[PDB]
Design a protein around this ligand. Structure first.
Ligand SMILES: C[As](C)(=O)[O-]
Ligand SMILES: C[As](C)(=O)[O-]
Ligand SMILES: [Zn+2]
Ligand SMILES: [Zn+2]
Ligand SMILES: [Zn+2]
Ligand SMILES: [Zn+2]
Ligand SMILES: [Zn+2]
Length: 219
């Protein structure tokens, strides 16, 4: 079965695939996510959507999320991850992104945090992260735009690739180390509680994100 409903979900091994149409009331449209495979090594899935209205509101974040042992960011050694994906229609206003949450309480709900770390592998149509650009950051020898904004109790750092990274390999912990070292991130008192990869559509379509593989571990 496709996952078409707002919070339709599938779990396989340590990967959970969510349609997660959290912003569906902000516009008009539809979106269904298909799971291809999910094992202990990785997952493959796709999502297809069309959205209009609410030009600057995210409509959804269909994603694959990892089940892992939650732990303080200061005790993470590495978060090796790969993401191989493509969009068929790039004439859209959307991002492709990792989404991570941390909190001071390990038992915080997993859909929000004290902090949110996003890693945008792609930006289409000029859509912008939460907040404003505060820096240009070098991480693992690649340059990223670094944005910061806050909404209520949630503070969001977003690292943005200058060109789409359709075959990503990296260590997400490099980004936490960057924030710890350069932006006073409180690593020794924040637990990593969520690690996801997916796409945020604003407008456009029909368009399909095909994720040929996503793999992650928190070690
Ligand atoms: C130095 As700042 C813009 O991260 O307070
Ligand atoms: C040292 As700073 C908190 O202004 O990134
Ligand atoms: Zn239904
Ligand atoms: Zn909170
Ligand atoms: Zn808190
Ligand atoms: Zn707080
Ligand atoms: Zn700072």
């Amino acid at each position: 079965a496709q996952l078409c409903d707002q919070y339709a979900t599938y779990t396989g091994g340590v990967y959970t695939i969510n349609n997660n149409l959290w912003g569906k009331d902000a516009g008009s449209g539809s979106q269904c996510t298909t799971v291809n495979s999910a094992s202990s090594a990785g997952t493959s899935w796709s999502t297809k959507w069309n959205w209009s209205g609410g030009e600057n509101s995210v409509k959804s974040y269909a994603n694959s999320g990892l089940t892992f042992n939650k732990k303080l960011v200061s005790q993470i050694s590495q978060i090796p991850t790969t993401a191989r994906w493509s969009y068929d229609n790039t004439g859209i206003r959307a991002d492709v992104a990792y989404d991570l949450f941390t909190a001071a309480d390990i038992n915080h709900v997993t859909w929000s945090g004290d902090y949110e770390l996003m890693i945008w592998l792609a930006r289409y149509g000029g859509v912008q992260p939460i907040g404003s650009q505060i820096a240009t950051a070098t991480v693992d020898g690649q340059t990223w735009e670094l944005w910061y904004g806050a909404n209520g109790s949630q503070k969001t750092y977003s690292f943005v690739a200058p060109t789409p990274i359709t075959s990503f390999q990296g260590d997400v912990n490099d980004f936490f180390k960057y924030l710890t070292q350069n932006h006073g991130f409180p690593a020794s008192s924040q637990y990593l509680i969520t690690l996801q990869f997916g796409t945020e559509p604003f407008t456009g379509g029909p368009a399909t994100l095909s994720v040929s593989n996503w793999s992650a571990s928190v070690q």
